[PDB]
Homo-oligomer: 334 residues x 4
């Protein structure tokens, strides 16, 4: 009946995918692997959250399990995903959220232990999906997929509405992004992203992202039409997309607002793309499960063909919820 | 002449840093300071310690009505109303109007009543607007009250000038990711004119309005109506960054754009005002960098030869404060 | 049937008192004054909160009121408390939380408007109360009282337990305190308190507090036995008391832990003084209504007569609930 | 002539010891090992410093060295210290600042590669030194020593002064401490210190420190008379000690200020312990090379036996300068 899930990497995304799994009855986490955590430590990690507040529910552990609201969840213990006995616990989907196995060569190792399918919680050299955008393109032969990046999940629904209604001639994207675990507290090594090693809480930090190019993977007609970059800034969670586009068809501000609003009420995007015309700031989206919230009042245009659209996203919570949505969506496809 | 004598109204982030910078050059001196929330004793403390630009090194003393900085007396005034300030009495030629509350010509002009000769408003204002390196030569000697634009306009306009003169900017949209400033509160608090702006500064990304990009069309008139923009205030204590997305008329390869910026940074016109980097910089790398604008070639990107996103950094406190003094020096030569 | 409350100063305390008032059926806010807010602005302020999250109910407004979960609350915008029409809306208690009427002379002006009693949300030259500590000392002739400071409400219950069980010979307190509205975001003027003008988010800032001296006002036998200081540090909310004591009688760690735990379960301190033995940090107390949470793991001693007790407090939410508690407590006294 | 130094672990302490070494002609760094940095990345990390500002000089690199102000410094990449060829570069002292070789046996591994002496940049169970307090107890058989913690270097001079003038009967210390590299930017694993895993920039975090006990080793008569703890708070650098102690001989505030002032002017403590009576905050000590600055205005007493002394320290810069001072001091002893 329920889709049984294992989590590899019980981190920000792993633990919030876990929390979200507790709030819906169609999906459940039955096993967790994190080589940095014992069951008693996992319980501590679940219980308290700087961003998303305290867990409310019963938490206990055994030597090899945690017990959440009276339900046993098996705690595995292997550094090497090839050694994880997912099959022993009837795990159908593994959420690959360590941040270190985002290549197909790595993520596929979960299959060896009998997981049926893997969702990588990051861009990867695998089929890429964004709920509301291309999740219906999933094919049952695909055993390893990814849910793209948080930024892609914010941008793609916005781009979809813009392109469908007005046509994106070309776009340049900036995302102003909260800190994440990849950044250090002080100036420290980060050999693949130099700027990314600078003290996270005390700098605006340019970062590369592939989100805007990536949108061509989920909206093929936008391939080659977007590119972008990022600034990491000192906030603990919630990020924002700043998408500057030339549009083919003229759009009044009212027409863009109305298209976003319509989209947010549509079957396709309900709960994924949201709308606001209020005077919001980033903390207002903490624990908002949208992939994207269009900010009517912050979005501007120079003229009817050149616009800057602003869209908010809880990079932790929205994405985690989308991971579960993608598991549910694709699980019906056998 | 020999030294332009300056009075500072509002001894705040900009006022005190204009003061500090004035000590580093011999062609200008501050001879009077007015700040309604400070005593001479308090002013010395303000000068001495600075969370961002570090400790003052130099001698600081005060009297009942003066501060003494490296042995030199600076008169401390005390008037809430600019109309009351005896600037002429203290031989003040230029007033730096940096309170943040007299950015209207109607208020800032009142410094003239007390005998100041010229006034430079440290903010956008309904007056002639200047950005050093871009239009300071358009200054006319009859311009008695002028402004030095915003920190953001001072960062954006040099970039826009280089792009426009080389390739022609058809249209542009600007975002600035901006450090917090005194206008934001530490906790969610009233801001009746800018609601978002009342939210806790240190804990939010806050969209904010800015006329900086439109203002570029005032300092570069052929760009009037071709630019607009906005801001996100983020939790950094100082240093901000401009993100200009524009369509170019002539094609520009990345190399061309890189070369244009570099050549501009070396030119007499922009030297020290527009700088160039190709290094992996982040915002704190520009703390106490007196540039108006540092072009970031590695962070700047483009989609094609007519559609580009240029990234440029500015110490919103220190670059601006130095440009205020540059503007004073420049315009003082025009009588 | 229900104590009717007016709020003067709809700030961090004012708005959170208001939120707290929605969760209990024995008090209700029927009028709000704030000179910086239209009704429209007031519901914005309620709706979104950087620290305590978005309002979960429904908000509307009129030209003269706000409507909160369908209940109309009259709204005012009058600078002078003497001019507030509290009586016309049958306000019994006024919460004086502007921060600028913290003197008997000023705060008493509310009674001229027909309010019956006033609770000043800060130390003042009025009878001073701390729930759980001296609130039963209230006398019906006391028409203007105060609820002390957030720090006093944290320190006093901890001090009470220590002093009553073991006797405090002497105590020296430090509070590591979150930033508040009294601090600026950049180095700015603060003529009365020079350090207090320094950029709040980028400094550890020594500050003077009266809290430890204040505890003599609610625990007379401790008068002259405590003093202390504060460091303001860059957190948006939640503070912690660090109280170093010489005890008259010896106390083992166990005895201190169990005395605090017992106190936390007593009817006297239940919900006021709480206990933890978990690995908590400050964000774990965001929206914790305790005045004080004794931290058993963080508290240390050198020996049985020399201890350092650590106690957490949400300086916004704890105190705000205590204001409603004090109103409730004293209203019974006629 | 100069003492030739190798640095193992080119992190916050490593790099700042390096910068400080350029400002004095009696010591020079000739070799650097960091397993997370190429020479190219190394000069980036020197060039830009979030806290201490841009390197003013010019940097280049080769495949095996960095060039600083025209001078070649050899770059090693060995995870295992026993494989580091210090002797080949005539390295006398190794600064062991990786944070992971803080044991006698691990730090001694540098001797195998031909280093003559090792200074561990951290608490260790080795001979422990605080400049100004016990550096003259160094003996030449001590080939592996440590320079204590930043906190011990702040506290020890303060304790020495109190104890020598008034006698410390007992003391409890808190340090309110800047974030360091051991803390993550988001809630992350910290198996041996649960609280230390919580998001650094968004919490007041109780932490343990052995500084107070350690002062008992550096000042033997204080053994067993001090203990303490820490709160990590969101600042990028600079920390403060809050020492609450009981004095044997009664002391007035005046007598304490005068003792601290006299000490600060002594040959023994000049540049090490400083004195202020100004309204300072933590950023005022950024790049202040003192081990300790006694804050006369913030320090308080309850009575003449019971005092709370506040002392500031740039935990990065003061400490890094002390490392070089200790090397200079002990190098003379052969
Ligand atoms: N944080 C975000 O905002 C966000 C949003 C969307 C996607 N992502 C992506 O999700 C992934 C995880 O990100 P995060 O922020 O949750 O990271 P994180 O650092 O919070 O969590 C990673 C977890 O993996 C664990 N781990 C490490 N090696 C492991 C191994 N061999 N086996 C098992 N567990 C292991 C770590 O102990 C840690 O708990 C990354 O790919 C990241 O890019 C992050
Ligand atoms: N901080 C920046 O990054 C920056 C950059 C460029 C321009 N500006 C502009 O410069 C102006 C000042 O900005 P700031 O950051 O220095 O502000 P600030 O709040 O730091 O300084 C304002 C100062 O004015 C004083 N003051 C207030 N009323 C006064 C009066 N009646 N008479 C005299 N002094 C009075 C205050 O006491 C304070 O010292 C504003 O217009 C601001 O927009 C700021
Ligand atoms: N913030 C805390 O953690 C805390 C805790 C306990 C007690 N307190 C005390 O409570 C009081 C309020 O503190 P706060 O943090 O909520 O401050 P705040 O600045 O957030 O709120 C003050 C409010 O009063 C309003 N106001 C100002 N003048 C007014 C007037 N004449 N009439 C009506 N409204 C007016 C302001 O517009 C603002 O909304 C202070 O005395 C403070 O010391 C604060
Ligand atoms: N940061 C402070 O304020 C401070 C002050 C005094 C002492 N200390 C102590 O000094 C030490 C270093 O602290 P830090 O803040 O500089 O840490 P850091 O994380 O900034 O620096 C440690 C460096 O060691 C490198 N490293 C790790 N393993 C290595 C190995 N096997 N070989 C070579 N290099 C390796 C890392 O790549 C990193 O650059 C710790 O013991 C710390 O407790 C820190
Ligand atoms: Na479930
Ligand atoms: Na000068
Ligand atoms: Na109620
Ligand atoms: Na040297």
């Amino acid at each position: 009946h329920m889709v049984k899930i294992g989590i590899n990497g019980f981190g920000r995304i792993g633990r919030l995918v876990f929390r979200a799994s507790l709030e819906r009855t169609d999906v459940e986490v039955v096993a967790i692997n994190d080589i940095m955590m014992t069951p008693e430590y996992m319980i501590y990690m679940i219980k308290y959250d700087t961003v998303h507040g305290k867990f409310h529910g019963k938490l206990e552990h055994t030597e090899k399990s945690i017990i959440v609201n009276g339900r046993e969840i098996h705690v595995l213990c292997e550094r090497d995903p090839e050694q994880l006995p997912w099959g022993q616990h009837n795990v159908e989907y593994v959420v690959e959220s360590t941040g270190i196995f985002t290549k197909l060569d790595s993520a596929a190792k979960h299959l060896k232990g009998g997981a049926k399918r893997v969702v990588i919680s990051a861009p990867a050299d695998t089929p890429t999906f964004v709920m509301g955008v291309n999740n219906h393109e999933y094919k049952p032969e695909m055993t390893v997929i990814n849910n793209a990046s948080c930024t892609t999940n914010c941008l793609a629904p916005i781009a979809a509405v813009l392109h469908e209604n007005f046509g994106i001639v070309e776009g340049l994207m900036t995302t102003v992004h909260a800190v994440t675990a990849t950044q250090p507290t002080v100036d420290a090594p980060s050999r693949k992203d130099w700027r990314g090693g600078r003290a996270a809480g005390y700098n605006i930090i340019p970062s590369s992202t592939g989100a805007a190019k990536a949108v061509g993977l989920v909206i093929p007609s936008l391939n080659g039409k977007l590119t972008g970059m990022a600034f990491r800034v000192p906030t603990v969670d919630v990020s924002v997309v700043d998408l500057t586009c030339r549009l083919e068809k003229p759009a009044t501000k009212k027409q863009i607002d109305e298209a976003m609003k319509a989209a947010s009420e549509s079957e396709r995007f309900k709960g994924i793309l949201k709308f606001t015309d209020e005077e919001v700031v980033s903390s207002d989206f903490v624990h908002d499960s949208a992939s994207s919230t269009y900010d009517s009042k912050a979005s501007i245009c120079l003229n009817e063909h050149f616009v800057k659209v602003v869209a908010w996203y809880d990079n932790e919570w929205g994405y985690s919820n989308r991971v579960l949505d993608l598991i549910k969506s694709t699980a019906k496809i056998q």
